[PDB]
Amino acid sequence: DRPPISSWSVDDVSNFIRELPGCQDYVDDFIQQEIDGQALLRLKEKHLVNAMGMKLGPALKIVAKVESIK
Numbered sequence: 277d278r279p280p281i282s283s284w285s286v287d288d289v290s291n292f293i294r295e296l297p298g299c300q301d302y303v304d305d306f307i308q309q310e311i312d313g314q315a316l317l318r319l320k321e322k323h324l325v326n327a328m329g330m331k332l333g334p335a336l337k338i339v340a341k342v343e344s345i346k
Contacts (some may be wrong), residue, residue, distance in 0.1 A: 279312065281345060286312045288312075289313060289315075296332055296341060299338060302328070302334060303325065
C-alpha cells in the first residue's frame with residue numbers, strides 16, 4: 277500500500293499531499309521546499325503555519341495523517 281515514509285521521495289510526498297482532503301493547493305509548496313519523507317517526519321504545525329504560511333486546518337490534517345501512518 278505504502279512503503280516506509282522515510283523512503284518517500286519529494287515526488288512521493290507531493291502525491292500524498294495532493295490526495296489529502298483540502299490540501300491540494302499546497303502541492304507546489306512542498307515540491308519547491310523539497311520536502312521528502314525524512315523531512316515530512318520532522319514537520320511540525322509551527323513549520324507548516326509559520327514557515328510555509330499554511331492555514332491551520334490543512335496543517336493540522338497533515339501532521340495528524342503522518343502521525344497515524346507512522
